[PDB]
């Protein structure tokens, strides 16, 4: 698919994630887009 989606400086609608709280069960829908807290600090917005 190098002929259709390959475009520099654009097409930022496809969004991937890497880390969350728990390992969720297989074939489960991904809806939630709240941030993970670091545990040591009370993360609420931009954190450390």
């Amino acid at each position: 698919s190098n002929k259709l989606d390959s475009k520099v400086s654009g097409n930022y609608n496809y969004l991937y994630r890497l880390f969350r709280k728990s390992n969720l069960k297989p074939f489960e829908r991904d809806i939630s887009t709240e941030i993970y807290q670091a545990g040591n600090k009370p993360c609420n917005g931009v954190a450390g």
Binding site: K25, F27, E28, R29
Partner: protein, 42 residues
């Protein structure tokens, strides 16, 4: 990944005896279920 529904109709605390629940429908969707609800009427 398969929704199995087993039912058995018996004319009658749970009453004593035994009745093997026969499969009614098998719905081929594989939707994820974590909690479940019940509904009543008035």
């Amino acid at each position: 990944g398969y929704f199995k529904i087993y039912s058995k109709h018996t004319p009658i605390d749970l009453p004593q005896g035994f009745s093997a629940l026969e499969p009614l429908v098998d719905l081929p969707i594989g939707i994820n279920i974590t909690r479940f609800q019940t509904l009543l009427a008035l």
